[PDB]
Amino acid sequence: VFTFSVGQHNYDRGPIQWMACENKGYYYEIPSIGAIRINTQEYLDVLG
Amino acid sequence: VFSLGFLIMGTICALMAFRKKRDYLLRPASMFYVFAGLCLFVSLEVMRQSVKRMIEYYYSWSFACACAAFVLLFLGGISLLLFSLPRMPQNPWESCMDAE
Amino acid sequence: FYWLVILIVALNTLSIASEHHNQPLWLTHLQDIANRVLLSLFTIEMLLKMYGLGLRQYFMSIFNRFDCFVVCSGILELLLVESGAMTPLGISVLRCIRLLRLFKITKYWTSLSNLVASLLNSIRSIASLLLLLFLFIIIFALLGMQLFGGRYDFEDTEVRRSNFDNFPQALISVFQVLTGEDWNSVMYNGIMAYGGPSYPGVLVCIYFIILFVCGNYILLNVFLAIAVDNLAEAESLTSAVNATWFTNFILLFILLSSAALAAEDPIRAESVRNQILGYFDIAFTSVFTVEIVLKMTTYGYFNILDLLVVAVSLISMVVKILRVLRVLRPLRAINRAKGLKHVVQCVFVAIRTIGNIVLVTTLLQFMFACIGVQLFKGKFFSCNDLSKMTEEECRGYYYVYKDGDPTQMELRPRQWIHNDFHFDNVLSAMMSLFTVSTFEGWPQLLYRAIDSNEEDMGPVYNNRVEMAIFFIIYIILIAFFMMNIFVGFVIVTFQEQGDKNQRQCVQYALKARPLRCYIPKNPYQYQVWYVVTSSYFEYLMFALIMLNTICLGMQHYHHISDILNVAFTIIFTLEMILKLLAFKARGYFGDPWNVFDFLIVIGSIIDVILSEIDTFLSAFFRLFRVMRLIKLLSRAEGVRTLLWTFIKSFQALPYVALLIVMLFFIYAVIGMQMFGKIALVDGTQINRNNNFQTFPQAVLLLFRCATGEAWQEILLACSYGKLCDPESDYAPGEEYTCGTNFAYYYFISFYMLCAFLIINLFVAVIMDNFDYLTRDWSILGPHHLDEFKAIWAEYDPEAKGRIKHLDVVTLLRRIQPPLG
Amino acid sequence: QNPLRKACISIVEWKPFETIILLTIFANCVALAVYLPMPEDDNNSLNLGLEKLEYFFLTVFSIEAAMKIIAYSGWNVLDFIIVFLGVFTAILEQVNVVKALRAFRVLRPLRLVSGVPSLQVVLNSIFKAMLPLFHIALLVLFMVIIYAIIGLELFKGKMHKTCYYIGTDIVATVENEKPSPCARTGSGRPCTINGSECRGGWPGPNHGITHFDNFGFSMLTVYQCITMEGWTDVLYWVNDAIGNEWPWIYFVTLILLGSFFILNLVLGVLSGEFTKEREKAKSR
Amino acid sequence: MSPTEAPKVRVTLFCILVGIVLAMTAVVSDHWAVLSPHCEAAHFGLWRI
Ligand SMILES: CCCCc1oc2ccccc2c1C(=O)c1cc(I)c(OCCN(CC)CC)c(I)c1
Ligand SMILES: [Ca+2]
């Protein structure tokens, strides 16, 4: 499971981090457009 | 020609205000002058738009003449109206349309 | 010990104020080392007077009560420091507790402790209405949460911090709207949250209209009340050649010299206008140098000013600073005009009187600046893109997206940026707090401080909302509570200098005069006089004016209005004809309202003929029909009386406003000389609509700064390092050398001065109306005898002094019991 | 009036029944504060839990109203309106299986005023202190109307032209410049962006909110200018639209009469009211 | 006779007279605008160019 928290918001981010690194996944944050490209390609580091 | 007629009417009103204690007649006359001068303003405005439809344009002699005429007419009419008006009361007893 | 204690508290204040960001290590060592020594001195001075006057009576005064708390807190903090104290924010705030010691200064002046005795009572008595204001704020925050909560979901990348997503943010937004700063942006966001500028979407603005007006009124109310109440106890407890031709000639030439100084070219070094002005200047100087010889021969503080002005004008045929000293030409008129000298003396006495509240306000601003330095030191740095959080990270280039479209990008270099208003030291903190107190740009500082993360790191969105508290209290204390006592100070100060009811009655009785009524003979015209004087005619014409106003408001972008215009013009021309026939043109022009009606009718007629001749084949002539409802003032008695009684007061003080005019002139000329060569760039605060390039533009800029627009942005746009005007003359290679840091002295002073004189003008005008403003309309008033004069004129068509006695007998039956 | 057939609960009113009701309203205000508004019909666990707790407040208010209405208005009419609106909303929202009635739940904090006599007398004094401001309110309204009509005649349909990029529908601006009106072959301003052309069809400066197109919008922008919050923006936009020479006369005067003169009037009247109130209270 | 015999109204009336005379001269003087397209000295007026 790879979870992404997208945008600027006040909602809790703990549950999705737990989902991420409980099911051997990873957690990413995408706050803006300029952070999209870098954050949508790092899941291949985990898969390797 | 409308402004010329206003100038004429203001002239007769001002001339007649000086006789038979007709001071009140100095009040309307000023307006005519104002309006006459006021017309001149928009009058030159029309000339301006002609300048804006037909290169370089210059104003040398009669433009300052017309502007000074308009300024004199407008300011003099306003000042004459203010002077002919009695006064601001400034006192609880004093008021407009009093006993001289 | 009276001087020893003040010396040690001054040393402590200096040590506290010496702390800043990136301070040298030796300064840090001096600061924490000196804490122990001064704490020890405080302790030894505690135990000395403890034995000197005994344990029991030491606590009788609250001044020495909190010294116990100061010493105990210092000891506890020193004990806690040597432990595992994490949370550097916690360290910042415990350090903040220390700052309390500064209270010691407030305990070393008698007048700094005498005033609190009444303000304590006033605050405790008005806490009910303060709680009412807080409840109003809470209710409107809840309403905004209901109306705009979760509706700012716009599909753009724009940031809207002032929203209603939760209770603290809604509370902050409501407070910001109450302060009135950038409330229109919040209203626009609320309108766009709904459909938009359409029929249902615009009505939300009503909310803001209710939030502002009704919000400020009670706000003003409470604080105003506080002031006067406290200031009441501030006055009750405390009390318990020589010819006129030559003078007019000199005054006219001074005025013309000032006008020549105003009209000038600050950009071009040698323009076509400049040398003519120089010839005029030398001609005026030649005139002004013969005025001093005519006085020196015939005579021996004000003539020295004229001599200095003439000397600096003549000696000029950094040196360019001398070109600024010639703005003293208008000040010479102060000597010539007696009223100007009197108002200058009065305003100087006013500033001398106000010396007990500016001191405490400045001290509280300094203390809040120290607290802000403790809180936000080093935390106002940022990067171009928010993804980089460190200065070494904020290097290279990055992409910006236009309108938030991922396929439209542009490269920009990223740079570590420091905020223009920060809290790195006490001076910058005081500047930031001064900008906050004027309610200009304070939400920006608020949202910059909320995101403050660390001492050298970038912001984190909504990191610390609680920091908003720091920005609220300071506004409530300084910007509300102590800026209203200042206004309340001058009100009662001029109240003191401001039976007598019987004196007014008798003087009005012996100084009155009958007024004409002009009842006409010749019943043929008496009929029309009766029909045009009856209340039915005036009511009908009032209804027609209302209908005309309604018709004027029905026009919109993208005719029937032409027919209605002609019909109304014809009907008002018929009004004027009938009035002229009834009053025989003699009593018609005696009434100023009929004068106004004549002017409006003629203007409307000319507009109608102009429109017709335009159609058969200029925009301000259409303004004559709008002015018609102004004549409604002839029917509203209360509104007309209020307007007259304030216009009379304004006309009675032509020299109080002359000070404001002279200040505007002087500052405009100085700004033209200083900030004149700055280039006009779109996107900056100096552009085609806002600059110092001409006198009208400089005066407009100063007027804008007076009303409280983004004047701090103008200040930042005039500092050193700006691009010079291409048409100006400068050495090649140095284009970004225009502007000066003197702007900080130029704006900060002007605002304060412009904030003072205006207040002066507001209070004096009020004082002249004090009899009318504080009037009991039940016991007696001039209105009763005014209506009595109306009855007298009704029964006396001509003044002719007095009339038959039986006439007065009838009037007695019309006299009310209030009069007789 | 009626015999003791139903008024057997008038004794418990004198009990400290007001303190528990004050605490109940405080708890209700706290519950209102902690509610989180969510976009597009979303919710969380806490919001669902507060929709059930508001039933507890509603039944308490209804039983209080029932006890007081049978034992025996003044301030009690507001309480009845609040409880009736709450009950009506609660019963209406559960038969559809809009949400505008919930906006009436923000009047419940006003009940605190009903619980403290000092707040009642303070609010009464505030209401009584606004009567002398009637003439100033009339003057302000008339001046706003007059200036709105003048602006409607002067600047109607003028701020509808801006310069986009040539061939596109994208407004051409610079870094820190908000979109502003434009004029081609006129007294207005030309924009200096290279690939830009000036044309119409532009809704307006503030997303089509700030313009003198009809009476409502002209009135709104005149009111916004009177508060001296963004009046220079309107002046600059009119300058870019029609020209720089004339428009300031409309705006500066509006600031001089609509803002400074009116503020002086209201300050003078309020100061006189406070002074005469203090003088009247001094005699007692 | 206060607002008639006063000099401040007589100087205003003289200003009105000089203004009307100068306005009449301005109408005849059709030389307030020269247009050179750039031998073609053009004079512009309200009655006749
Ligand atoms: C020679 C300078 C005399 C005037 C002057 O000096 C001060 C020093 C410290 C604080 C205030 C003053 C001051 C004022 O007259 C002054 C300044 C302001 I800013 C101010 O607030 C303006 C109204 N509002 C801003 C929108 C906030 C209350 C007021 I009232 C009075
Ligand atoms: Ca503002």
Does residue C433 sit in helix, strand or coil?
helix
Mutual angle of helices C656-674 and C695-707, in 10-degree steps:
120
* DSSP-assigned letter for residue C723: P
Of D277, D266, D137, the residue nearest C776 (C-alpha) = D277
Of D56, D57, D61, D68, the residue nearest D12 (C-alpha) = D68
Q: Phi and psi of C165, rounded to 5°?
A: -70, -35
Taking the CB of residue A30, how many other CB atoms lie within 10 A of it? 16
Residues in C touching D270 (Cβ below 8 Å) = 220-221, 224
Are the beta carbons of C445 and C428 closer than 8 angstroms?
A: no
* DSSP-assigned letter for residue C725: P
Q: Residue C546: what residue type?
A: M
In angstroms, the CA C592 to CA B21 distance is: 19
**Calculated CA dihedral for residues C275, C276, C279, C283, nearest 10 degrees:** -160
Taking the CB of residue D177, how many other CB atoms lie within 10 A of it? 14
Which residues in chain C (772-801) have CB-CB distances under 8 A to chain B?
782, 786, 799
Does residue C412 sit in helix, strand or coil?
strand
In angstroms, the CA C753 to CA C702 distance is: 12
Tokens linked to D222:
């005149």
Q: Residue D217: what residue type?
A: F
Cβ neighbours for A16, distance < 8 A, ≥ 6 positions apart:
A3, A5, A27
Q: What is the 3-state secondary structure (H, E, C) of C647-679?
A: HHHHHCCCCHHHHHHHHHHHHHHHHHHHCCCEC
CA distances from C434 to A9, C429, C440, C475, C745 (A): 33, 9, 9, 11, 13
Are the beta carbons of C181 and C443 closer than 8 angstroms?
A: yes
Does residue C737 sit in helix, strand or coil?
coil
Residue with tokens 């900080």: C744
Q: Residue C552: what residue type?
A: L
**Calculated CA dihedral for residues D30, D34, D38, D44, nearest 10 degrees:** -110
Are the beta carbons of E2 and B76 closer than 8 angstroms?
A: no
In angstroms, the CA C221 to CA C126 distance is: 11
Nearest protein CA to atom 6 of ligand 1, as residue: C752
Q: Solved how?
A: cryo-EM
Which residues lie across from D197 on neighbouring strands? D164
Interchain CB distance below 8 Å, D215 and C554: yes
Residue with tokens 């200065």: C391
Q: Where are the alpha helices (DSSP H) in C732-820?
A: 742-768, 770-773, 782-795, 805-814
Tokens linked to C760:
């002066």
Tokens linked to C36:
């122990």
Cβ neighbours for C68, distance < 8 A, ≥ 6 positions apart:
C46
Of B98, B91, D131, the residue nearest C638 (C-alpha) = D131
Report the separation in Å between the CA atom of C485 and the middle of ligand 1, taken as the mean of its atom positions: 11
Of E21, D134, D194, D3, the residue nearest C639 (C-alpha) = D134
Are the beta carbons of C222 and C126 closer than 8 angstroms?
A: yes
> Is the CB of C305 inside 8 Å of chain B's CB atoms?
no
Nearest residue on chain B to C507, alpha-carbon basis: B93
In angstroms, the CA C350 to CA C551 distance is: 51
Long-range CB pairs of D8-17, under 8 A, 24+ apart, other chains included: D9/D67, D9/D70, D9/D71, D10/D71, D12/D67, D13/D67, D13/D68, D13/D71
Are the beta carbons of D205 and D180 closer than 8 angstroms?
A: yes
Q: Which atom of ligand 1 is nearest to the CA of C351?
A: 3
Q: Phi and psi of A22, rounded to 5°?
A: -105, -40
Task: Write the residue in A8, A10, A33 that is nearest to C401 by C-beta.
Answer: A33
In angstroms, the CA B57 to CA B45 distance is: 15
Measure CA C687 to chain center. 24
In angstroms, the CA C677 to CA C729 distance is: 9
Cβ neighbours for B55, distance < 8 A, ≥ 6 positions apart:
E35, E36, E37, E38
Q: Residue D92: what residue type?
A: L
Are the beta carbons of C376 and C449 closer than 8 angstroms?
A: yes
Rg (Cα) of chain D, in Å, rounded?
28
What's the distance, Cα to Cα, between the start and end of chain A in Å?
Answer: 15
Which residues lie across from C285 on neighbouring strands? none
Q: Phi and psi of C148, rounded to 5°?
A: -120, 0
Instruction: Give the residue, out of C222, C756, C761, with the most ligand 1 atoms within 8 A of its beta carbon, to mutate for a pocket test.
Output: C756
Report the separation in Å between the CA atom of C751 and the middle of ligand 2, taken as the mean of its atom positions: 14
Residue D244: HSE in the Cβ half-sphere, 13 Å Cα cutoff = 9
Nearest protein CA to atom 8 of ligand 1, as residue: C358
In angstroms, the CA C19 to CA C31 distance is: 8
Tokens linked to C443:
């939400």
Report the separation in Å between the CA atom of D227 and the middle of ligand 2, taken as the mean of its atom positions: 9
In angstroms, the CA C640 to CA C650 distance is: 15
Q: Do chains C and E touch (3 or more CB pairs under 8 A)?
A: no
Residue with tokens 């746009």: C717
Q: Residue B90: what residue type?
A: Q
Which residues lie across from B57 on neighbouring strands? E35
Does residue C407 sit in helix, strand or coil?
coil
Q: Where are the alpha helices (DSSP H) in C54-194?
A: 65-81, 88-99, 103-106, 111-114, 116-148, 167-179, 183-193
Which residues lie across from C139 on neighbouring strands? none
Does residue D197 have a known ligand-binding role?
A: no
- Residue range C112-237 forms a domain whose CATH class is mainly alpha
Tokens linked to C516:
């004409």
What is the CATH architecture assignment of C1-111? Orthogonal Bundle (1.10)
Q: Where are the alpha helices (DSSP H) in C199-302?
A: 199-202, 205-236, 244-262, 274-296
* DSSP-assigned letter for residue E47: S
Residue C809: HSE in the Cβ half-sphere, 13 Å Cα cutoff = 3
Residue with tokens 């309403």: C143
Report the separation in Å between the CA atom of C437 and the middle of ligand 1, taken as the mean of its atom positions: 9
Residue A35: HSE in the Cβ half-sphere, 13 Å Cα cutoff = 14
Please calculate the CA angle D166-D168-D174 and round it to the nearest 5 degrees. 70
Are the beta carbons of C450 and C186 closer than 8 angstroms?
A: no
Of D255, D256, D235, the residue nearest D245 (C-alpha) = D235
Tokens linked to B34:
């104002």
Tokens linked to C547:
């209908």
Q: Residue C182: what residue type?
A: D
Residue D149: HSE in the Cβ half-sphere, 13 Å Cα cutoff = 21
* DSSP-assigned letter for residue C617: -
Nearest residue on chain D to C206, alpha-carbon basis: D220
Measure CA C439 to chain center. 10
Are the beta carbons of C595 and C589 closer than 8 angstroms?
A: yes
In angstroms, the CA B57 to CA B36 distance is: 27
Of B79, D261, D259, the residue nearest C647 (C-alpha) = D261
In angstroms, the CA B14 to CA B46 distance is: 30
Tokens linked to C269:
């070094």
Which residues lie across from C399 on neighbouring strands? C411
Of D71, D72, D63, the residue nearest D7 (C-alpha) = D71
Four-residue CA torsion sign, C57, C58, C61, C65: negative
* DSSP-assigned letter for residue B22: -
Tokens linked to C244:
């006129």
Of all helices (H) and strands (E), which one includes residue A6? strand A2-6
In angstroms, the CA C21 to CA C29 distance is: 14
CA distances from C782 to C505, C506, D213, D245 (A): 8, 11, 46, 46
Of D39, D179, D64, D177, the residue nearest D115 (C-alpha) = D64
Specify the length of chain B in residues: 100
Four-residue CA torsion sign, C503, C505, C506, C511: positive
Tokens linked to C190:
């609320």
Of A3, A6, A40, the residue nearest A18 (C-alpha) = A3
Taking the CB of residue C2, how many other CB atoms lie within 10 A of it? 6
CA distances from B78 to B29, B31, B74, C374, C591 (A): 11, 8, 6, 63, 17
Four-residue CA torsion sign, C219, C220, C225, C226: positive
CA distances from C31 to C23, C43, C293, C302 (A): 11, 18, 62, 50
- Supply the DSSP string of chain D, one letter for each residue: ---TTS--SSHHHHTTHHHHHHHHHHHHHHHHHH----SSS---HHHHHHHHHHHHHHHHHHHHHHHHHHH---THHHHHHHHHHHHHHHHHHTT---GGGGGGGGGGGGHHHHH-HHHHHHHHHHHHTTGGGHHHHHHHHHHHHHHHHHHHHHHTTTS--EEEETTS--B---TT-------SSSSS-----TTEEEES----TTTT-S--SSHHHHHHHHHHHHTTSSHHHHHHHHHHHH-SSSTHHHHHHHHIIIIIIHHHHHHHHHHHHHHHHHHHHHT-
Are the beta carbons of C96 and C374 closer than 8 angstroms?
A: yes
Q: Phi and psi of C664, rounded to 5°?
A: -60, -45
Q: What is the 3-state secondary structure (H, E, C) of C305-374?
A: HHHHHHHHHHHCCCCHHHHCHHHHCHHHHHHHCHHHHHHHHHHHHHHHHCCCCHHHHHHHHHHHHHHHHH
Instruction: For chain B, count helices (H), then strands (E).
Output: 3, 1
In angstroms, the CA D42 to CA D46 distance is: 12
* DSSP-assigned letter for residue C623: G
C406 Cα to chain A: minimum distance (Å)? 7
Q: Phi and psi of A28, rounded to 5°?
A: -135, 155
Are the beta carbons of B83 and E37 closer than 8 angstroms?
A: no
> Is the CB of A31 inside 8 Å of chain C's CB atoms?
yes
Residues in C touching A31 (Cβ below 8 Å) = 386-387, 461
In angstroms, the CA D198 to CA D184 distance is: 6
Specify the length of chain A in residues: 48
